[PDB]
Amino acid sequence: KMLRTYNIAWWGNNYYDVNELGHISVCPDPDVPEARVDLAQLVKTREAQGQRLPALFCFPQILQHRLRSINAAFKRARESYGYNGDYFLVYPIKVNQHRRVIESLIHSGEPLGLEAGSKAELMAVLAHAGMTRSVIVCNGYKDREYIRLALIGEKMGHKVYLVIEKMSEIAIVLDEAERLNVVPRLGVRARLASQGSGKWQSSGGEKSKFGLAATQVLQLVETLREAGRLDSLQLLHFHLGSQMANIRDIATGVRESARFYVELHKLGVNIQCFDVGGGLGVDYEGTRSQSDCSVNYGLNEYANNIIWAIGDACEENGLPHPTVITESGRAVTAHHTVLVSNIIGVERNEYTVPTAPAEDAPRALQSMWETWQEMHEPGTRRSLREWLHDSQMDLHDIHIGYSSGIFSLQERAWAEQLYLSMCHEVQKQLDPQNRAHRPIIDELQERMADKMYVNFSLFQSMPDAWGIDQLFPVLPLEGLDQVPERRAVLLDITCDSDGAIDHYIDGDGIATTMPMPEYDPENPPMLGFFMVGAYQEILGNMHNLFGDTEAVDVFVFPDGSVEVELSDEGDTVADMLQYVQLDPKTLLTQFRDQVKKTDLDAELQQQFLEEFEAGLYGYTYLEDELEH
Amino acid sequence: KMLRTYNIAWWGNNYYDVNELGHISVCPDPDVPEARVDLAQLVKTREAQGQRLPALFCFPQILQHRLRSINAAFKRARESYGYNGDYFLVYPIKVNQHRRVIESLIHSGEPLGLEAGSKAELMAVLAHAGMTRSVIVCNGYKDREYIRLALIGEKMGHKVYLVIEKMSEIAIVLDEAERLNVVPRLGVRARLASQGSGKWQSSGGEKSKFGLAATQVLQLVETLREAGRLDSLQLLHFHLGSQMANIRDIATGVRESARFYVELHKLGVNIQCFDVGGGLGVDYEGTRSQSDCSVNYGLNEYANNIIWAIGDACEENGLPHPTVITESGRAVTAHHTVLVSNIIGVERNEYTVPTAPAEDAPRALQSMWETWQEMHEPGTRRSLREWLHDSQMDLHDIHIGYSSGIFSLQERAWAEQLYLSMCHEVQKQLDPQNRAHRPIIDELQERMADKMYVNFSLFQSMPDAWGIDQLFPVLPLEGLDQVPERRAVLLDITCDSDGAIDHYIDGDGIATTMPMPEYDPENPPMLGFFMVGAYQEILGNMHNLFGDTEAVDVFVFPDGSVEVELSDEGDTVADMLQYVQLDPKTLLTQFRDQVKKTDLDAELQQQFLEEFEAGLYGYTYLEDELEH
């Protein structure tokens, strides 16, 4: 029932699933369902083989399959409607610039383009591109340097589209086009009034980054008429934003932007490209709803909505079907990487039968003991709801009273334990079928859950979980077959209390606590963080000087073999000290001296520069210590 | 009135202020009020001298003065009460590890310590420390390697305190203490029940990072009794969190934690250190209230509350006054650095007298024009509230109607402009004294504000403004003397619409728009972001591959001279491409080849590797282009 309460089947998209052994297995390519891998086994294997603690396992095969899937979805819709236009995805580097992603996509069989949101990204795109004539599209604020490079990429051979997202831009691109003597290939991004909040305006106090207002789109078409270059403007672009929860928001977005296609044609411009610009959401929770981190529409539904919109739009006015482009970055990168780490220590409560308090102790403590004895004796069993309220209030009195200076620490420590024992007892008697026992059964699972510490940095590995309440499915890599025997809250090894997971997946909705299988506190399992593929890897900050986690690319062939090559090095203490300008080399020698004036033997004096230098050039994270 | 609506006088703490010239000047050391600097002039100076665009100006003199101020505040209270204990601040590297901060503090006259929240930070602390016996305190999750290093620092000479924040830790420190044969100097961090939410428990599902439960504190004292080392435990620690808005939360925090001091003494332990652990807030808004980004208590008030608590606590039970330690990181670093950048472009609306629509145009447009003509003619002037509602609804009809395909883009562009003209007109007639004209005067300032684009990355320079709605005072470096002539919303050059400032300082409260002085849109002023000192610099992420901004240390002597030495290099496109594994060198040559097959002259073919290599090893940000 635990694989059902985690919704693995739903957000897993057939890539992840619990094998016939309780362990979570992964099938990087669901086209060959027999090519699976015991993720838990693979971890243990690499673990005992010398693998670094917090690791990032990536299955580039998923990137490719995912890409092939959306293309298939748009194909399943192009034919079903009768659309005569082509369709290809244009991955926006923004969501992940990592070589692995850019490459896995390029080196696939499906046709795709690359979008750059800045001059720096354009550079990286041109890099990955190579001598292969690839399609590139440039967005973001543009200046001379950027417009130039863009134009230089066009003259280079590459079919690069320069999206006009600000009137003042068209002036520059044109001038620089003559200076470099190159025929500009550019597109336009129009503001939409569909959202509904003054997003249509181009100068309003509304926080709408780019886009051309209705009047400015006409001025662009007019300016291109003067320089006789309407043939240049050939791409239409609009972005509704990332993670579009509600499908209607999208329909209302293409419906409108689609009229810009026809209205622009009536003015003469051609435009063979209709760029719906990403927006396609990814179900993170696993309930497939209209919530925050979840979409209420499937892959096909999205495709249909898109094609049909531009479709009927053309038919009506008798126009040719343009090439449909999309920039669903998050959509493809989403679940191709899993963060995996270990439990470095746990805080399980210790149930101990309480002993009568000092005969001459405060009444508050006598009261708590009076209630305890009353539980253990044939009286009333439903009166437990009351006994609870009793212990809670007495504990509160001695607590507030402790600060007042009218209760000893020994007394407070005593009361606290009796109360924790009171819970452990009431939690047993509790009846799950009784309506008055359910609001408490949930209250106790909280005040009785384990507090485990995972070997990672939330700010480094899942920053989106900080800036936004980004929900990421977190679960143990094994024992997913049995029923939850206890709850637990998990927090990272950051000294900041803000480093922990707030909400967890729990079937119907999200709970403040995470359900865990019966595990040995002396030897806990590994933890897996999924859907942590987009906007994550290269966007974390070194909180307590914790650097990049190590990453590995895992492959699974129909053959049955499994390749696992290194993908990322992983920062070391030394790397971090370089950032804050310290230089490890000069720091080593400074230690070499202080240790000579140790006045201690040469035996120990040297095994210290070993310990020091070891940790100096060693991983940034912690080592598993037996303090669970 | 603009220097009053920005509250500069309040959050400026005499460091920042508008000089007798409209420009914002800075006095890094208010002990010498005649040592000021025209910040706007300094920027322009360095600007025309070749300084990089987005720059970070830091006045290390402020760090020192700030430190001297809090020490003075605690001194003003130690005597006033009659406290016989010493007091010194212990700066937690966590809030800023940058050499400049660590150094400026160390190289000051005031006594201070350093706190490390991880093994990596401990390394950096030991580094900055040097051969100068300094006080160090270790926090955060600890493992062998970390505990060792800590102990090795004690044997080294440094007085390093190892804070016990988890029962399982005391086992290790003890064992490693014998292995390294060193007498351990450690402190303990106890959980408090003051907060009120089960934070007192050590294993609850509550997200409380570290701390020892009442029972565990007794077990620690007991374990140290067996190994006969109660003399080792000599530091008491508690952390209420960062930015404590309400002063009462603090009083209630020391009051309780103070009893742990006395209760622990009764058991025999000594404890000469009372660490209240940071928490001291900084007023960011400038209203000095109990809001989110603002405290309701001054420097002295905090000091008093602290000393008095531990004070009376001792007197009562007849105990000696312990050394009072605090870790107010944010408190000292807060305002010693200002982010400064330029406006790369603005979006001001263009008022143009509308022309009658096509005689055979839809009624909706006829309706908008009908209302326009009615405004320009001796009829009713208070009926403007109505005319507004009229234009709004007609514009909405043609808008929704445009998507329906029953309105041409020419018509939509027309209506939009007539409406924008309608506003510009109604905004003039509007009466500020009329009660029914104020709810609109605010509605128009929004839909008529300038949209300017600042040359920076919110995610790189002020990440805290993303993960939390961190308010930072943003204002122009000049023209602060005059009255706001227009409002404006400012957004960064990130292609993501989430890159902008949501709220701005506006006297009483925060507004969604920022008030700007009458400026030339062709030649705008510089912008300054203040209070951006803690948790900022080294904690931003390269969103669109935008690297670290450049930083400079500015000095101002009583002499009148101003020194401005370089502090940080500032990433270049090349640096960024290294991160995503690309290597610029091998990328240069790949271009060298594609340009040889350009089939174009050698004149242009070479001025391209110039342009390319220039931007490749050039700053990461954009260049000021005349598109404002």
Side-chain angles (χ1 to χ4, degrees), chain A residues 121 125 211 314 342 353 420 523 569 620:
Chain A
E121 307 205 317
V125 180
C314 289
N342 47 2
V353 280
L420 286 185
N523 181 196
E569 268 287 12
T620 174

Side-chain angles (χ1 to χ4, degrees), chain B residues 95 99 134 151 165 193 198 224 232 302 316 415 435 441 524 536 558 619:
Chain B
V95 314
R99 174 186 287 285
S134 237
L151 295 176
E165 314 174 77
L224 292 183
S232 297
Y302 175 82
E316 298 176 1
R435 168 154 287 114
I441 189 68
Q536 244 49 39
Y619 202 33

